[PDB]
Design a protein around this ligand. Sequence first.
Ligand SMILES: CCOc1c(OC)ccc2c1Oc1c(OC)ccc3c1C(=C2)N(C)C3=O
Length: 123
Amino acid sequence: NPPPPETSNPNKPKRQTNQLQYLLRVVLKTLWKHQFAWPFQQPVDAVKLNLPDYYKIIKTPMDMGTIKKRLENNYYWNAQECIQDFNTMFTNCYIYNKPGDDIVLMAEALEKLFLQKINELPT
Ligand SMILES: CCOc1c(OC)ccc2c1Oc1c(OC)ccc3c1C(=C2)N(C)C3=O
């Protein structure tokens, strides 16, 4: 396993916005409770899951546990930076797998719910 993505970085500037607060309180914390959220709640453990190929394929890993910690740390500058991490998480799953796979059906459902929730953000 590679080290997981950073959740703090002292030389990166922090920020808190209404949209970032919403991304934690509403978007992440609601998606977290979905029946399909469990594979996406922590970094992929390639040793545990017996996927020695995972990090040979996926070079920018991302997961909701990392995103949650970043939001709690005020790690992001703006909501778009956080949204990009969600999009990276979804696209990694499409890249690593193939259409119709159970894990892909899970990501597809979560992506739709994510888009529903971010369609309208606070001002
Ligand atoms: C059966 C293992 O389930 C787990 C799980 O278990 C604690 C924890 C994380 C994952 C996971 O499953 C899979 C797969 O399973 C065959 C196949 C592909 C992917 C994942 C996955 C998340 N991601 C992100 C994938 O791209």
